[PDB]
Amino acid sequence: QGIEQISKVYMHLPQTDNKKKIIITEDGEFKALQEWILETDGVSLMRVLSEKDVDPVRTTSNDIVEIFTVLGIEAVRKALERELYHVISFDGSYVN
Amino acid sequence: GLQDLGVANGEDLKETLTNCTEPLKAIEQFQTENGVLLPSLQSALPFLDLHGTPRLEFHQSVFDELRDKLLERVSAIASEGKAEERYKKLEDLLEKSFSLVLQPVVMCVMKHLPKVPEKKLKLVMADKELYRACAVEVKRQIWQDNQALFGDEVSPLLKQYILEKESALFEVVQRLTRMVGKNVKLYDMVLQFLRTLFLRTRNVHYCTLRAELLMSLHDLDVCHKFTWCLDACIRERFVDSKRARELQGFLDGVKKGQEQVLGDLSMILCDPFAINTLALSTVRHLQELVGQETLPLLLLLRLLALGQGAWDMIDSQVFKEPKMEVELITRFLPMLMSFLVDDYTFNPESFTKFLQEQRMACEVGLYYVLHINALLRLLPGLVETFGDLAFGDIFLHLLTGNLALLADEFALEDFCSSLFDGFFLTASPRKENVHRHALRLLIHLHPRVAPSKLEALQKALEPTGQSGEAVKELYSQLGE
Amino acid sequence: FSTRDYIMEPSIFNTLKRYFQAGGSPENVIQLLSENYTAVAQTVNLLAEWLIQTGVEPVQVQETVENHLKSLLIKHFDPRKADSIFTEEGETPAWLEQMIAHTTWRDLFYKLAEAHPDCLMLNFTVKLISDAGYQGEITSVSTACQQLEVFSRVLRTSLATILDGGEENLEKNLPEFAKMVCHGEHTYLFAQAMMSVLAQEEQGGSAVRRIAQEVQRFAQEKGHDASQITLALGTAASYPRACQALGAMLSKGALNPADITVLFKMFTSMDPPPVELIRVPAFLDLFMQSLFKPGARINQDHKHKYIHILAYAASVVETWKKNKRVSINKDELKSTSKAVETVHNLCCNENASELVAELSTLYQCIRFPVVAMGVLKWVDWTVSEPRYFQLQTDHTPVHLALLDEISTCHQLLHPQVLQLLVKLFETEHSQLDVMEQLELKKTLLDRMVHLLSRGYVLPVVSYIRKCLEKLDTDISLIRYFVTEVLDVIAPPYTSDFVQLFLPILENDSIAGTIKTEGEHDPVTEFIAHCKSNF
Amino acid sequence: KAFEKKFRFDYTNERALRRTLQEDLVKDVLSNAHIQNELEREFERMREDREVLRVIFPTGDSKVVLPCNLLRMIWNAQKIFHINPRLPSDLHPIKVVEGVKELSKKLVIVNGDDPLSRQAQENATLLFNIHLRSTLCSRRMAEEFRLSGEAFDWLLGEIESKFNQAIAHPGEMVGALAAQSLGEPATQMTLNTFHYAGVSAKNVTLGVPRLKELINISKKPKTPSLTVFLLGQSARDAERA
Amino acid sequence: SNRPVMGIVQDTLTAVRKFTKRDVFLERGEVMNLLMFLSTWDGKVPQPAILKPRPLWTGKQIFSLIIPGHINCIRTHSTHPDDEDSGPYKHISPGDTKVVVENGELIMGILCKKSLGTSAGSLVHISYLEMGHDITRLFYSNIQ
Amino acid sequence: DDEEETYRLWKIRKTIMQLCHDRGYLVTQDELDQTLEEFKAQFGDKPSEGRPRRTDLTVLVAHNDDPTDQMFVFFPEEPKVGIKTIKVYCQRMQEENITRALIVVQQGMTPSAKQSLVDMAPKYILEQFLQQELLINITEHELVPEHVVMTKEEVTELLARYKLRENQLPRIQAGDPVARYFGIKRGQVVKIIRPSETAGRYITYRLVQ
Structure with a gap:
């Protein structure tokens, strides 16, 4: 059972606002909804989306080579932007 | 004004209260009363609004009529045109027409009035069509304007085409409105009107009808679809070969019929942009054949199709024109001679005169493409052929070639183009005279022909009695 | 003699008066007579009503919309400059017509909009509300209860509704009753006098005194300082020193050792006062706050005095024969003192093996009710202290079994136990494993299903339906609750309980709930019993 | 509803217009319905701008980087000109709208009249124009700020000058500047800043080696992690999770 | 990081914090000793905060003399109570923990690292934004 | 299954x-x-x-x-x-x-x-x-911005107005799955509309080569 090149996968509720999903409550408010998300220490991407019930819009990884081979150079541009910004502003320090 | 049951009752009440007592309270009670309005609200209105007007109630009734039209549209979209909803809408429209002489009734008729047996009677009653003929697209827009408004648009369409031709020598919204007010019978009437306009104009109306049909097929069209696709392919790539091959295959696999192929060929022939694209494609095919060195082959089939399209307007209920392979080879022999002269330069006259004497749209297009020692000899032969032809389309192509030569900026070529433009302005009508005046205003960059060009423009304005020629002479005098 | 009008027949009296007595240059009179240049507005409204009948909606919705539009137009162009003048001038026909037909929301809307002018109109509206069989169902405004008759009648209707309903009505309509019986303190005092006479009447006196207790509590968080006033209504005002000391202690909201020695000394006596001054629940709430706190250790010089005061408050009885006490009991206050003293020592030493070894004796004390809810609120404070969950063996089994034993021993503590459990379930604890939080919520549901087994089933299923409708929790938690409830229930079934447990049972993955039952089919038998009942 | 009550500047509330604006101002606003049409058009434009902002920021964050601190220029203009905003305003909302539109045409990043150039210019200063129109909405000027005309056009000159200083000069060594400006926080930030946790937490191992492999992307990173989101009730249920 | 990087060193930072503490009552001789070291001083003595019984100035007055230009800012102290913000006394600080400066005059607030250091939107940062960089340099020197 | x-x-x-x-x-x-x-x-x-x-x-x-x-x-x-x-x-x-x-x-x-x-x-x-x-699908991702393949007339006026050439224009590889999805051959220019955090929108230009 399962897919290949994947180790034991953890799950959690993202307490942080950006990672937990946000909906537009119709009065005009951004409401952050906490919901169970998964995290694989062994990435098998596009196979994780070949599997059922997964969100294709919100699925993102921490590698660069595979998303270069699949999602393209502008996508890995935005992804490396997000990852490097996260790593630098982990301690709250801002960079431009 | 409008005389409904309530209007007649109000008129009778006014006539009865004009005299014979008619006290205020009893007269008001016998004349009018508000069923929806509460008596307490009616009593409190005089003490608060100071005899307020019923305009707020009228605006509320107008909003309720708009909401009723929206509910009728919702019912027609949910039940798929329910019979009970359609009957209720027709009854409401008839009541509104009987009461008010009718914005809500017109809105209801425009929202849902399909197959109105009483809608026909309502149109016959409002056969004047001051505002309702344009407001009611269901009745007035759909076959109501076929008798008179269609002819008025056809005359305005011809005027717009003439104005566009004048602007080119010096529509879309109407077609979109005609397509919006279109049905099966409306499309049949529009096709008949386009055929009549094409027969009257000798090709301009056919080109306009073909353009309108192509525009509808691009947006809201629904062998006509294949013809529209072929026309769109030709417009996208006039020099393209796949679209031409598809059109030739469709023409080959199109069975003979009663006037349908004749009308399609007539549109393809007297389509001006289509004619220019076909001439450009024929010139490209001739250039490719000359490059390959395999002259006689789809070029002969394309030339035969162009000749059949040209003859479809001349003769009705015809199949096509003769091929004439020997004549095509004789015509292409001057092209081979011109190519040999160009090769000799980079390393005849009797045939050109014969081709100019013969009436040929393909020959005129070849002369226009050529205009746009051996080369010098071929150029005088091409000029002689153009002078022997002396057609309006040939004159327009010669004006385009003269503009191209002026853009090229050759001295001797400029002098020859100025002489040809003067001859064409002398021979042709006031439009050709104005074109020659513009070509002479752009001409005479050298000082040896500038005063001569001004004298020729003055002599053409004086001898040309046309108002366009006089305006061109005045513009030339003002410019220089 | 003008004859120039199209729809001016509505203003016919004014037009006739203007035509009769215009004189000079009647240009303005002619303009007023010919102002209605449009067609007959009433006939156009009748035609619009006929069109609405022929259209989609042939109902009275159009008439209701027209009445609402007329009321909105009146509210917009309300002549507030001379509304009082017009009302006090005429006051008969407009008020009479409004009360006869348009008494839905027009008068109440005008009163709640301004309520300062139009004294005659306000009096007419009050008279109409009094003459109506339903007493003031139109004028329910917190600032419009400044009239004695209207406020007394609204108080009568609200008290009748509360007494007709009961507990399930008590958790719903008491804020909207308290919002006008606590709006003005003079109205509060009048209501206190009325229902104090009602409590002096013996039958229903317990329920009335409970209403007085909760109104006094609501006034306490609202901002009233009516503890001395409640004491004045009570018999404790007969003794001036006792009344002054008790009022000062209630106003302070804490416990004073010198003042409580004074209370002990006027107590422990051969002629005790009537017990209600120590039976008032706000004073016992002060003892709850001061005594069984996890912190705030008392000096324990008068510890026996505190414990004896609690024993006298929660133990002794009396027989009121013609408002005279001649038979009292004092044999249970010693055991109550021993239990409360043991619990106070447990709260003082606050330590876990010895805590369990004394938890056995603590359960033996939990058999007492005052001990039970003191331990309940102590557990509430201890768990509600943040970062309490840093070590678990069965998701705080000692305190959660204290909850179970309290619910088992006393059925009346179920609302407070439910409030604590739903507060703990609503609070999200961070800095913990997601699976550990999941199992903690599961164990909270285990305790609340224990409450369902003890019989607080209608509010438990109600809270499940409420928390599933709003702030949707985990489907695994809902499935686990449903599976355990079907495990613990058995036929016969009450139709109300089946109806309350229905939609939660037939939504949200019944096939997901069915995992490994096999021997006993919970949901299939529930379907069979529901179809047999309904 | 809060956006409407904060940015509509409703003209029907005559008492509100008497308190906010002068008598000539309210009578001119009520007389000229074209002014009310311009305010309604501005309100529709800023509603579309609110939709654009909710598109560009799906996250509920209102902090952004901008060349100007417009609240501070409002405060400075107020305390320079001595507004005393207890008194009603003396500036017309139509003057506010024409001033903010004139400034919006004043600032330029891409020159030329190519439609491509104009589209690029508008996409470049799209967010900043939205922010400045949001701050310069007529309701906030008339109610909350109440600046005079001299304060208003002096403010417009100050904003134009500050943005003109805020443009980027050409020829600056931006690439080496950026490489250094990212290298320095790497020097400040520590690889030992990760103090781990009781749970595995997927072994985030951010820091110096993480930034290392981001600088030179390795085909086999030390911890290639993937974050997975589900669609619906599958994630809502822990059992389906 | 669009932040100031000059900052204020630790000793002068702690000293100016104790100087901007609310209860500073400074003798006339000491104020006399202090107001030579302002380079950008206008040359006129300011009014003392206390006039009777004795002429006493205050540290906020002296810092208002220090600050050139007219800058408006609000900053929060490191020990500022958010519940004090939420409830009453939001404009009358019991602990003087709301750094408020208006028109080049320091109204209230105990200056700290969060108000004077490398923090974004700091007083020296907005000073370098508004008036001259040389003026801000003189401001640093006068402070020191 | x-x-x-x-x-x-x-x-x-x-x-x-x-x-x-x-x-x-x-x-x-x-x-x-x-x-x-x-x-x-x-x-x-x-x-x-x-x-x-x-x-x-x-x-x-x-x-x-x-x-x-x-x-x-x-x-x-x-x-x-x-x-x-x-x-x-x-x-x-x-x-x-x-x-x-x-x-x-x-x-x-x-x-x-x-x-x-x-x-x-x-x-x-x-x-x-x-x-x-x-x-x-690839274009459904929020990480993936909008892509529109531009035609030759737009390419010519673009190069004329910016005074740059096809090699100076930044490239995108032909075998990339975005280019494979869009079916774009060698040396053809695609505009990309991307959401910009600091400017709202950005219009970047790439060439399949």
Whole structure:
């Protein structure tokens, strides 16, 4: 059972606002909804989306080579932007 | 004004209260009363609004009529045109027409009035069509304007085409409105009107009808679809070969019929942009054949199709024109001679005169493409052929070639183009005279022909009695 | 003699008066007579009503919309400059017509909009509300209860509704009753006098005194300082020193050792006062706050005095024969003192093996009710202290079994136990494993299903339906609750309980709930019993 | 509803217009319905701008980087000109709208009249124009700020000058500047800043080696992690999770 | 990081914090000793905060003399109570923990690292934004 | 699983229709988004040993305008496609008048047939794809911004106005799956509209090379 090149996968509720999903409550408010998300220490991407019930819009990884081979150079541009910004502003320090 | 049951009752009440007592309270009670309005609200209105007007109630009734039209549209979209909803809408429209002489009734008729047996009677009653003929697209827009408004648009369409031709020598919204007010019978009437306009104009109306049909097929069209696709392919790539091959295959696999192929060929022939694209494609095919060195082959089939399209307007209920392979080879022999002269330069006259004497749209297009020692000899032969032809389309192509030569900026070529433009302005009508005046205003960059060009423009304005020629002479005098 | 009008027949009296007595240059009179240049507005409204009948909606919705539009137009162009003048001038026909037909929301809307002018109109509206069989169902405004008759009648209707309903009505309509019986303190005092006479009447006196207790509590968080006033209504005002000391202690909201020695000394006596001054629940709430706190250790010089005061408050009885006490009991206050003293020592030493070894004796004390809810609120404070969950063996089994034993021993503590459990379930604890939080919520549901087994089933299923409708929790938690409830229930079934447990049972993955039952089919038998009942 | 009550500047509330604006101002606003049409058009434009902002920021964050601190220029203009905003305003909302539109045409990043150039210019200063129109909405000027005309056009000159200083000069060594400006926080930030946790937490191992492999992307990173989101009730249920 | 990087060193930072503490009552001789070291001083003595019984100035007055230009800012102290913000006394600080400066005059607030250091939107940062960089340099020197 | 297979085939047809719509071929709304249950009623829910199977659900879709060039898709029964089978497919393009074809291989596609498709690509253009890469969509991702392929007139006026050339323009690799999804040949320019955190929107320009 399962897919290949994947180790034991953890799950959690993202307490942080950006990672937990946000909906537009119709009065005009951004409401952050906490919901169970998964995290694989062994990435098998596009196979994780070949599997059922997964969100294709919100699925993102921490590698660069595979998303270069699949999602393209502008996508890995935005992804490396997000990852490097996260790593630098982990301690709250801002960079431009 | 409008005389409904309530209007007649109000008129009778006014006539009865004009005299014979008619006290205020009893007269008001016998004349009018508000069923929806509460008596307490009616009593409190005089003490608060100071005899307020019923305009707020009228605006509320107008909003309720708009909401009723929206509910009728919702019912027609949910039940798929329910019979009970359609009957209720027709009854409401008839009541509104009987009461008010009718914005809500017109809105209801425009929202849902399909197959109105009483809608026909309502149109016959409002056969004047001051505002309702344009407001009611269901009745007035759909076959109501076929008798008179269609002819008025056809005359305005011809005027717009003439104005566009004048602007080119010096529509879309109407077609979109005609397509919006279109049905099966409306499309049949529009096709008949386009055929009549094409027969009257000798090709301009056919080109306009073909353009309108192509525009509808691009947006809201629904062998006509294949013809529209072929026309769109030709417009996208006039020099393209796949679209031409598809059109030739469709023409080959199109069975003979009663006037349908004749009308399609007539549109393809007297389509001006289509004619220019076909001439450009024929010139490209001739250039490719000359490059390959395999002259006689789809070029002969394309030339035969162009000749059949040209003859479809001349003769009705015809199949096509003769091929004439020997004549095509004789015509292409001057092209081979011109190519040999160009090769000799980079390393005849009797045939050109014969081709100019013969009436040929393909020959005129070849002369226009050529205009746009051996080369010098071929150029005088091409000029002689153009002078022997002396057609309006040939004159327009010669004006385009003269503009191209002026853009090229050759001295001797400029002098020859100025002489040809003067001859064409002398021979042709006031439009050709104005074109020659513009070509002479752009001409005479050298000082040896500038005063001569001004004298020729003055002599053409004086001898040309046309108002366009006089305006061109005045513009030339003002410019220089 | 003008004859120039199209729809001016509505203003016919004014037009006739203007035509009769215009004189000079009647240009303005002619303009007023010919102002209605449009067609007959009433006939156009009748035609619009006929069109609405022929259209989609042939109902009275159009008439209701027209009445609402007329009321909105009146509210917009309300002549507030001379509304009082017009009302006090005429006051008969407009008020009479409004009360006869348009008494839905027009008068109440005008009163709640301004309520300062139009004294005659306000009096007419009050008279109409009094003459109506339903007493003031139109004028329910917190600032419009400044009239004695209207406020007394609204108080009568609200008290009748509360007494007709009961507990399930008590958790719903008491804020909207308290919002006008606590709006003005003079109205509060009048209501206190009325229902104090009602409590002096013996039958229903317990329920009335409970209403007085909760109104006094609501006034306490609202901002009233009516503890001395409640004491004045009570018999404790007969003794001036006792009344002054008790009022000062209630106003302070804490416990004073010198003042409580004074209370002990006027107590422990051969002629005790009537017990209600120590039976008032706000004073016992002060003892709850001061005594069984996890912190705030008392000096324990008068510890026996505190414990004896609690024993006298929660133990002794009396027989009121013609408002005279001649038979009292004092044999249970010693055991109550021993239990409360043991619990106070447990709260003082606050330590876990010895805590369990004394938890056995603590359960033996939990058999007492005052001990039970003191331990309940102590557990509430201890768990509600943040970062309490840093070590678990069965998701705080000692305190959660204290909850179970309290619910088992006393059925009346179920609302407070439910409030604590739903507060703990609503609070999200961070800095913990997601699976550990999941199992903690599961164990909270285990305790609340224990409450369902003890019989607080209608509010438990109600809270499940409420928390599933709003702030949707985990489907695994809902499935686990449903599976355990079907495990613990058995036929016969009450139709109300089946109806309350229905939609939660037939939504949200019944096939997901069915995992490994096999021997006993919970949901299939529930379907069979529901179809047999309904 | 809060956006409407904060940015509509409703003209029907005559008492509100008497308190906010002068008598000539309210009578001119009520007389000229074209002014009310311009305010309604501005309100529709800023509603579309609110939709654009909710598109560009799906996250509920209102902090952004901008060349100007417009609240501070409002405060400075107020305390320079001595507004005393207890008194009603003396500036017309139509003057506010024409001033903010004139400034919006004043600032330029891409020159030329190519439609491509104009589209690029508008996409470049799209967010900043939205922010400045949001701050310069007529309701906030008339109610909350109440600046005079001299304060208003002096403010417009100050904003134009500050943005003109805020443009980027050409020829600056931006690439080496950026490489250094990212290298320095790497020097400040520590690889030992990760103090781990009781749970595995997927072994985030951010820091110096993480930034290392981001600088030179390795085909086999030390911890290639993937974050997975589900669609619906599958994630809502822990059992389906 | 669009932040100031000059900052204020630790000793002068702690000293100016104790100087901007609310209860500073400074003798006339000491104020006399202090107001030579302002380079950008206008040359006129300011009014003392206390006039009777004795002429006493205050540290906020002296810092208002220090600050050139007219800058408006609000900053929060490191020990500022958010519940004090939420409830009453939001404009009358019991602990003087709301750094408020208006028109080049320091109204209230105990200056700290969060108000004077490398923090974004700091007083020296907005000073370098508004008036001259040389003026801000003189401001640093006068402070020191 | 039979249900998994029919769900996969439904998603394959759905993404093929969406691909054709985004590419610019005339696709009706019902095929653009039809229900999985509607497709099951259409074809029979049983791809395994049943009346629906491969090549049965192929489409021949014409362009929005100029319908002379039309695309059509191949679904070989074999997992690993055969060169003889793609030669039979070549015979099908020969008997058709259209030159645009796509191939869907269940497993890896043979390098001999890869070199073959490289060989006969200029005469008629054939593109191969894999089940997962056309089972999932790429433009639906929030990480992926908007892509529009620009035409030659826009390219010429762009280079004229910015005074730069095609080598100076930043490139995008031709074998990238974005370019494979959009069907873009060598040296062709695509604009990208991307959401910009500091400026709202950005318009960047890339060249498939």
